[PDB]
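From the methods appendix. Each design record in this collection lists the tokenized structure first, followed by the designed amino acid sequence. Records were kept in a plain field format so they could be parsed without special tools. The example shown here is representative of the layout used throughout.

RECORD:
FOLD TOKENS (223 positions):
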């Protein structure tokens, strides 16, 4: 997260760190056995790390659970990043408590102007490299589809939305991918992509989770 702030330990209890020997993507715990992340975060041998703050120190509230099954969206297109969503079933159920909790799926789509909380252990530099060991947070409003489509001509589909600042300075970044974009307690987006981090007029693009609730529910119910 660029231009964000330190969230604080376990203040984003649904945030998960997808680990394959190291943190590579974020995710959101949607229930005790399921994590939602970006399909572009797909990897084999994903160990889901819950209750994380400092990803390099065992602080005592972590739950490291290996994935049993990964389900990338049937229409995920790695070229356009359309349908950039993936479900990860945990081998064993996460013990949900105050530091590790699920985030609610949206009942409706969030709109432009909606303020959201984006979190991740991604790069904090817009021009440079610095990865935080502790979870970073960023408050960013969902931008209007017009601003989004104008920033990314012909690249924004109905399953995407821009969130952030057109002035740049604040944005998701590498390593934040798959992370949650929660607005008013509901997971409305998944850190999907951007042309860079915190670039002027190039807001981050997120997977519009509200378009996948049916798929998410149906998938979970049958796996
Ligand atoms: O521009 C890109 C891709 C982004 C996706 N992209 C297309 C191409 C055509 N249509 C849709 C998307 C192809 C190029 N990247 C540069 C930025 N990097 S990044 O700095 O690692 C990164 C990763 C995830 C991000 C997520 C957000 Cl929400 C904002 C910035 C982000 C920046 C990722 C690849
Ligand atoms: Ca830790």
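DESIGN:
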């Amino acid at each position: 997260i660029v231009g964000g702030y330190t969230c604080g330990a376990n203040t984003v209890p649904y945030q998960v760190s997808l680990n394959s020997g190291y943190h590579f993507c974020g995710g959101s715990l949607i229930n005790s056995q399921w994590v939602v992340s970006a399909a572009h975060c797909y990897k084999s041998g994903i160990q889901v790390r819950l209750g994380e703050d400092n990803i390099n120190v065992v602080e005592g509230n972590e739950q490291f659970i290996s994935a049993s099954k990964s389900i990338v969206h049937p229409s995920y297109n790695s070229n356009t990043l359309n349908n950039d969503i993936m479900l990860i079933k945990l081998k064993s159920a996460a013990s949900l408590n105050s530091r590790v909790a699920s985030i609610s799926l949206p009942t409706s789509c969030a709109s432009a102007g909606t303020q959201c909380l984006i979190s991740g252990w991604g790069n904090t530099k817009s021009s440079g490299t610095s990865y935080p060991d502790v979870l970073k947070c960023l408050k960013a409003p969902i931008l209007s589809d017009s601003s989004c489509k104008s920033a990314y001509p012909g690249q924004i589909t109905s399953n995407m939305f821009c969130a952030g600042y057109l002035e740049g300075g604040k944005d998701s970044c590498q390593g934040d991918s798959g992370g949650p974009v929660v607005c008013s307690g509901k997971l409305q987006g998944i850190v999907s992509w951007g042309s860079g981090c915190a670039q002027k007029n190039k807001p981050g693009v997120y997977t519009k989770v509200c378009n996948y609730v049916s798929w998410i529910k149906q998938t979970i119910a049958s796996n």
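APPENDIX NOTE: The pocket of ZEN (ligand 1) is lined by residues 80-81, 155, 171-174, 176-177, 191-197, 204-206 (CB under 6 Å).
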